[PDB]
Amino acid sequence: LQATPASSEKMMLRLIGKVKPQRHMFSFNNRTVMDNIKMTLQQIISRYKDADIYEEKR
Amino acid sequence: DRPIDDIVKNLLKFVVRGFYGGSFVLVLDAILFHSVLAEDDLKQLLSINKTELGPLIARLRSDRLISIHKQREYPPNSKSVERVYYYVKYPHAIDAIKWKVHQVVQRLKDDLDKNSEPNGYMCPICLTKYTQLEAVQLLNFDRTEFLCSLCDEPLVEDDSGKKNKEKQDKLNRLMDQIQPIIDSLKKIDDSRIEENTFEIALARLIPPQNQSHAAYTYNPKKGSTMFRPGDSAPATLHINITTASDEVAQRELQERQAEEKRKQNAVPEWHKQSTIGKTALGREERENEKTLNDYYAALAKKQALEDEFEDV
Amino acid sequence: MVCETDVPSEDDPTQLVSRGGCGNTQPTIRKDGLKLVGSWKKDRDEPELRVLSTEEILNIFKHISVFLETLEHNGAPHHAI
Amino acid sequence: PRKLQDLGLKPASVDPATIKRQKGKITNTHMTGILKDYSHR
Amino acid sequence: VNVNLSREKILNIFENYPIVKKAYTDNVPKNFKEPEFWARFFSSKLFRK
Amino acid sequence: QFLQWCTLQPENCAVFTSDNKEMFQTESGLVVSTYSMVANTRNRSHDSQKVMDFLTGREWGFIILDEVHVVPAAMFRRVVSTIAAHAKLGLTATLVREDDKIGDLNFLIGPKLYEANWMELSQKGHIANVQCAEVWCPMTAEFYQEYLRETARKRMLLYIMNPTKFQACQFLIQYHERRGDKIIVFSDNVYALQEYALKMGKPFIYGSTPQQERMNILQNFQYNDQINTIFLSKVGDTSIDLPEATCLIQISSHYGSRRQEAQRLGRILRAKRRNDEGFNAFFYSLVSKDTQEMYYSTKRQAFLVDQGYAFKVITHLHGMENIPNLAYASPRERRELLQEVLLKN
DNA sequence: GTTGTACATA
DNA sequence: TATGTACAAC
Ligand SMILES: [Mg+2]
Ligand SMILES: [Zn+2]
Ligand SMILES: [Zn+2]
């Protein structure tokens, strides 16, 4: 989950697909909404990463 | 979103639809349905020209039901342009509504009080009214009628002696028609409403168009100490299931870790033994189980672009 | 050029005392024609310039602690006003 | 807002005026270019 | 934060809290795997209730 | 550490040092400073004179004197009379000093409340065990011939830079660096410190080093993998926390101070890996054979012996000849060093 | 960068 | 008393 630094005027957010990896990049209008969506997305991606790690365990 | 927003919007909707014309309903509802709305986008939504949108905005801005926000925009294709956005500042609009409602009620109350007082005589020729106290000093020698000081003409008694009941009905009519405003205000006072801003209003934006020229973003200048009037307002949880085999592995890892630490901690040679006489320091069971399994199976058978980014 | 919301205490140094203020940097007011144009010096590069509307000055002067209508009524973009 | 308070009506706003919007000499140089800045942990 | 679980502990959780078992049996084979359920359960308000 | 172990918010904490001098504006706060910034009387800067008045004016409730073995000095004791305080606490590992002023603490801050045995806490895993050693480096004939004729004030610099000590220090550093250890080298002589540092290309800290540089060096030595060892001086002889340090080497030392030896050994007594099985920190003291340094070395360790530490003599370093390169290995280099050092003499 | 002053030891 | 070294200030 790629997010632009808070020190930049842009509010762009990119999701990179796991493998020409699929990239879905969205630009927001308010930082508050951008942060709220980012936190929710991070939970899903992080949880899926843990699930994939467990699957790869065996 | 929140109960507070719904009640405030309803109060704004009621005031506009009742105390304003028709086009005002369209303009304010568009900027209530949406967040901060550009002037160009508003025109496209309502399909009205600038000459028709201007009068609506001006009257709504006078009553502080809509706020304006001007900022410079820098598009790569065209030269820098100034864009105008319209939104609603609930604290301002609600305060304006409360003041106007009180003033309207007070004005009718004052008119009713004034009407109940004795009427003041008026002169027909010069149309200069006179109160009872002022007319009493205009009495003539024969004391028949009040004579105007300027015209020297008899005074005529003024009207409004019969309206004593009409104004009471008018006040009754208003309070009945204005009841929803009072009821909504009571609930608003009970709660506390935060003041909105262009940036804050952008958190609830529903874009009107697909390729709107207005970049609906707030990019304030860096370290700009300039202030305009009315420009501001007041973890991860990772789980690890430990299988019986994993526990055995953990014990093996602990033993290996202990061995690694022990080797690193081995005392040097010179400290192990006391060196005093040395020179100067200078320079197959599987078939057994299978036959049992076959026998037990027989037993069972028998028995059965490049952009800066960071990683989040 | 600053409101000094907090000022050092006279009695004891290195002990700030809160005073009524808003800490807004003041402009370098200059008289352009018949209007007052204020220029602000950003902390961190041309200074910010805007026209001090008489309404803004009237409001400020009223806070200091005995002796056109047709246009603004309808339309009249900010440039016309 | 002040006028509304005078009449006993709670004002849902505030005056904007009330909005309070407010060493060089290095000793050792032979290690230059080797020390990474572990400023924080 | 890493929380270590065990098969014996998992069975104990089911015995002591029948509500946890109810949410486990009806979702583990249908919607998401067991590891996701426990990660969600700890972060939920039920684990706090 | 204060912001870590307790809940005192940063807004209530203020540090009074040569870099920054701002004081907390809260009703009650904390001030952490140094004696040098509180004991000066003659001339104080306009920015620091206000701080002293701020310290003196208020009636403080608690004063903590770290390393209280320096308060009974000629001038430092004035910190007890100027800064009013209801309760005074003194914290020090060694309560000894050469002069008889040690007893002055009785009427200054109070008596001795509690004392803990060094070995008792060592066997309980609270502080790391140490295998102290004293390496005897035989001075070469070329240098020793000048050690006799020269005067006392110039002898110190002469037996501190003997080539054999360089070889011993280099060998020990290489051996422990291969062992994955963090080494600290102490030297009371600044000239020897710089010479050793430049020869081995390792950082050094002493009086002239600015606060920012030394703080950066210490942080790097703690977290940076490349920086395995650092050279310290009398400045870091006490009150510096280096949890990653596990080995200490001495090439120079003050004349006869037993306190300095104990304080230097303290740098490694707090090693992080002080509980893993078989761990043993080290404390090397490189001395010159048949020199006046041996007189002080047997006198400089009279306090550690009392606590229970045992010093053993190392007459030879095994595997030291097989090292590929050693400093001053050829007579040409040794003669050059003798001419270079004698120039300063 | 330098000068006036302590502390710790012969 | 002399001599190193470290420290604060100008
Ligand atoms: Mg300490
Ligand atoms: Zn008349
Ligand atoms: Zn101000």
Swiss-Prot record, chain A:
It is found in: Nucleus. Component of the general transcription and DNA repair factor IIH (TFIIH) core complex, which is involved in general and transcription-coupled nucleotide excision repair (NER) of damaged DNA and, when complexed to TFIIK, in RNA transcription by RNA polymerase II. In NER, TFIIH acts by opening DNA around the lesion to allow the excision of the damaged oligonucleotide and its replacement by a new DNA fragment. In transcription, TFIIH has an essential role in transcription initiation. Belongs to the TFB1 family. Component of the 7-subunit TFIIH core complex composed of XPB/SSL2, XPD/RAD3, SSL1, TFB1, TFB2, TFB4 and TFB5, which is active in NER. The core complex associates with the 3-subunit CTD-kinase module TFIIK composed of CCL1, KIN28 and TFB3 to form the 10-subunit holoenzyme (holo-TFIIH) active in transcription. An additionnal subunit, TFB6, plays a role in the dissociation of the SSL2 helicase from TFIIH after transcription initiation. TFB1 interacts with XPC/RAD4. XPC/RAD4 recruits TFIIH to the NER machinery. Interacts with the NER 3'-endonuclease XPG/RAD2. Present with 5150 molecules/cell in log phase SD medium. This is General transcription and DNA repair factor IIH subunit TFB1. The gene is TFB1. The chain holds residues 48 to 121 of 642 of the full protein.
Swiss-Prot record, chain D:
It comes from the Eukaryota. It is found in: Nucleus. Disulfide bonds: none annotated. Present with 1150 molecules/cell in log phase SD medium. Belongs to the TFIIE beta subunit family. Recruits TFIIH to the initiation complex and stimulates the RNA polymerase II C-terminal domain kinase and DNA-dependent ATPase activities of TFIIH. Both TFIIH and TFIIE are required for promoter clearance by RNA polymerase. TFIIE is a tetramer of two alpha (TFA1) and two beta (TFA2) subunits. This is Transcription initiation factor IIE subunit beta. It comes from Saccharomyces cerevisiae (strain ATCC 204508 / S288c) (Baker's yeast).
Swiss-Prot record, chain E:
Signal peptide: none annotated. It comes from the Eukaryota. Transmembrane segments: none annotated. It is found in: Nucleus. Residues 1-49 form the BSD domain. Component of the 7-subunit TFIIH core complex composed of XPB/SSL2, XPD/RAD3, SSL1, TFB1, TFB2, TFB4 and TFB5, which is active in NER. The core complex associates with the 3-subunit CTD-kinase module TFIIK composed of CCL1, KIN28 and TFB3 to form the 10-subunit holoenzyme (holo-TFIIH) active in transcription. An additionnal subunit, TFB6, plays a role in the dissociation of the SSL2 helicase from TFIIH after transcription initiation. TFB1 interacts with XPC/RAD4. XPC/RAD4 recruits TFIIH to the NER machinery. Interacts with the NER 3'-endonuclease XPG/RAD2. Belongs to the TFB1 family. Component of the general transcription and DNA repair factor IIH (TFIIH) core complex, which is involved in general and transcription-coupled nucleotide excision repair (NER) of damaged DNA and, when complexed to TFIIK, in RNA transcription by RNA polymerase II. In NER, TFIIH acts by opening DNA around the lesion to allow the excision of the damaged oligonucleotide and its replacement by a new DNA fragment. In transcription, TFIIH has an essential role in transcription initiation. Present with 5150 molecules/cell in log phase SD medium. This is General transcription and DNA repair factor IIH subunit TFB1.
From Swiss-Prot, chain F:
Residues 167-321 form the Helicase C-terminal domain. This is General transcription and DNA repair factor IIH helicase/translocase subunit XPB/SSL2. Residues 1-113 form the Helicase ATP-binding domain. Disruption phenotype: Essential, it cannot be deleted; epistasis studies suggest it is involved in damaged DNA excision repair. Component of the 7-subunit TFIIH core complex composed of XPB/SSL2, XPD/RAD3, SSL1, TFB1, TFB2, TFB4 and TFB5, which is active in NER. The core complex associates with the 3-subunit CTD-kinase module TFIIK composed of CCL1, KIN28 and TFB3 to form the 10-subunit holoenzyme (holo-TFIIH) active in transcription. An additionnal subunit, TFB6, plays a role in the dissociation of the SSL2 helicase from TFIIH after transcription initiation. Interacts directly with TFB6. A motif (DEAH box) lies at residues 66-69. Changing residue 5 to L: In suppressor mutant. It is found in: Nucleus. Belongs to the helicase family. RAD25/XPB subfamily. The modification Phosphoserine is found at residue 330. Present with 825 molecules/cell in log phase SD medium.
